[PDB]
Amino acid sequence: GIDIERHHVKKSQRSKPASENVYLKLLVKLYRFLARRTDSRFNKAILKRLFQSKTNRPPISISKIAALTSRKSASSQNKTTVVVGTVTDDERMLTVPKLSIAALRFTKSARARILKAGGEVLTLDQLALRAPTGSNTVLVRGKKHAREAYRHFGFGPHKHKAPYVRSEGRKFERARGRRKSRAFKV
Template sequence: MAKIEMKGIINKSRTKFVSRNVYHQSLINLYTRISKHTTNATVQRIAARLRMSNNARHPVNLRKIAEENEKNPESIHVIVAKVLDDETLFVIPKMRISCLQISNSAKAKIEKFGGEVYTLDQIFEISEKLENVNLIKGDMTARKCYKYFGACGIPGSKTYPKSANKGKNREKRLNK
């Protein structure tokens, strides 16, 4: 049978992750290469999260990591995003973190209380089989643009109206 050619159909979806950050690109290459040759679910999850867009990799607060550390204190917490400091936390428990990026104040606070901070490529030096690893993800709806998604006029809806005119008699958010 002859194969029929489909003309005019172009696949415009992105097939390869594009990043100007050389370190991020090398991490993606490392984890995708490892995930092809292993059946470990955590490696495949980390590789998938590394390939996510910047909007999908939400930053994680130090308070959320401290709450997760209370549930399982012996595990290594892996965050495929940026870790930010919480100024309301004065004392944090001892924890081990492996993350993509970390703020200077958060790193100083973790190391002050006896914790350890690793990069994502150092995680194989800590635990070779990736046992006792806890993946932590940031809140998806934390960004301000999520407040505008949905219908704003429905009773009980907490969404903000998308109005360009911010005058006196224009559309405003109902505080109910």
């Protein structure tokens, strides 16, 4: 026998989407070829993010794309923005700048606002033709840890995390262990 620490250490990766979307399978086929046949580390990233699940691909918004593309020091203003995921709308921004965004999905409000403001909406396959190697592209992500679950993950003594309460209120987990007047505060 052999003295081996760990046996058949499977990697924590996904080799294909769990989605059955035929169009997503087509995009996977195109970007699998692009990643395999080019040295574009961008294409490898897009292939990885196509495999990812919904919770690992959070939404991004028009305003957040505008904020990330209009920084002072950065000159990434005209570069095409790339999101592997949806691009939701932000109605809090009354005037939308001109943006060229390529993403899996656009909400109807976001797509209408972009095209009205003068920009353009692309799909991942269309960006595979404009910038096949991902040159002059700003690859961005949504705030993954903005889900409700991460309010609760890591709950414990003195962790300042949200509890699982059936009803937020005064008679609902506020007395013993939540204030120094009732025994102790945790």
